[PDB]
């Protein structure tokens, strides 16, 4: 069922990217980044497992594929979103790119390190499935992070040079976000109470 899972995930990702970015070429570029990251993680995990560095299960492989795809997509979204924010603010492509890197390089790296280290806690378990799921997930996440932090900026550098490719399409504010932020700032108490009550529902 792994292969069908992969196909369905790719279709869903493509549809969601088309819905969000409202363009086709940007979606293609993000999909290219996703493919690169996923292929890198899958290749390194398979290569290491083949030479008996560690054992593998179905769960480990499925988690590797899905998490690698999701992480690559999220990192691409973060980079392109910050770049587009800077570009729409008024900066030219060079300054917008440098601002994007300055404001998102540390965040992406920290998120990737958190995800990688989190799965490494499985290596200290007892049951063989959990213990075997630790290392491959961490290695795949590290490969994905490296690919996102190097190729991402590089592809953004090359693509933005040619034509009006990564420029924003929907030049609009966020009135809903303005309203939500104002509500949160003015009356934190009621909103916090509502959030806490909503979260406690899951204990039933």
């Amino acid at each position: 069922s792994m292969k069908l899972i992969e196909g369905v995930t790719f279709a869903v990702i493509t549809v969601m990217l088309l819905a969000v970015y409202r363009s086709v070429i940007t979606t293609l570029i993000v999909l290219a980044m996703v493919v690169l990251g996923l292929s890198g993680a899958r290749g390194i995990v398979a290569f290491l497992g083949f030479y008996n560095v560690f054992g593998l299960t179905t769960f480990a492989t499925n988690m590797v594929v899905t998490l690698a795809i999701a992480a690559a997509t999220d990192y691409a979204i973060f980079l392109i979103g910050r770049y587009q924010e800077a570009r729409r603010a008024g900066e030219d492509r060079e300054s917008a790119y440098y601002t994007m890197f300055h404001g998102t390089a540390h965040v992406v790296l920290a998120s990737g390190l958190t995800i990688a280290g989190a799965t490494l806690c499985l290596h200290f378990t007892r049951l063989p499935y959990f213990q075997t799921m630790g290392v491959p997930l961490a290695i795949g996440m590290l490969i994905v992070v490296a690919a996102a932090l190097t190729a991402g900026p590089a592809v953004i550098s090359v693509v933005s040079r040619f034509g009006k490719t990564l420029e924003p399409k929907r030049f609009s504010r966020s009135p809903g976000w303005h309203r939500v932020g104002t509500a949160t700032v003015r009356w934190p108490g009621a909103i916090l109470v509502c959030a806490v009550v909503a979260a406690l529902i899951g204990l039933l």
Partner: peptide
């Protein structure tokens, strides 16, 4: 006063992309 790392990424983008492609292709083909 451009930072060194993003400038390096921006300058040699094509070699980096090709290196990543080659490495991934080798790992997924061998």
């Amino acid at each position: 006063p451009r930072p060194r790392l993003p400038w390096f990424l921006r300058t040699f983008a094509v070699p980096i992309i090709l290196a990543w492609v080659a490495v991934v292709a080798i790992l997924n083909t061998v």
